């Protein structure tokens, strides 16, 4: 709630839909076993329900998207970065879904004055995109800015 990362919520909102690709309503603990087996983790029976009843606050063992933000605020324990590129990420992005996208990065070289072709701006993303989804994360934007 007061975790105060507006662009990580837009990351978590895509991340929450990964676990809940199965079904429209929220996580059902077999919907977590489906994505755990997709990684080949093969978790034991009756260890899933334990792994969800230690994140769930309000009974009803299904965990929902408000409760999902509680756990990820507790992890990724805390970062006090320069706060200037976090302002510049929100002006490079003009749709505000927390992803830079494939085309909007070409939409800023066209405005900054760089003659950059369609493939080379696609080459800019592939270097920047750790999870490889084709749109750079805000954290990928930070790791491509101040890490060097």
């Amino acid at each position: 709630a007061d975790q105060l990362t507006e662009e990580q919520i837009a990351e978590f909102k895509e991340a929450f839909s990964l676990f809940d690709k199965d079904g429209d309503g929220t996580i059902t603990t077999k919907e977590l076993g489906t994505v755990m087996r997709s990684l080949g983790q093969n978790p034991t029976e009756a260890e899933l329900q334990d792994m969800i009843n230690e994140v769930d606050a309000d009974g009803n063992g299904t965990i929902d998207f408000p409760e999902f933000l509680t756990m990820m605020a507790r992890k990724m324990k805390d970062t006090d970065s320069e706060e200037e590129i976090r302002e510049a990420f929100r002006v490079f992005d003009k749709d505000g879904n927390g992803y830079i996208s494939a085309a909007e990065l070409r939409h800023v070289m066209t405005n900054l004055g760089e003659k950059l072709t369609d493939e080379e701006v696609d080459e800019m993303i592939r270097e920047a995109d750790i999870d490889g989804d084709g749109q750079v994360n805000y954290e990928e934007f930070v790791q491509m800015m101040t890490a060097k």
Partner: peptide
């Protein structure tokens, strides 16, 4: 390429 990211690094600085 990496050349394009060095311009976006430059413009915020």
């Amino acid at each position: 390429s990496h050349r394009g990211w060095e311009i976006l690094r430059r413009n915020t600085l």
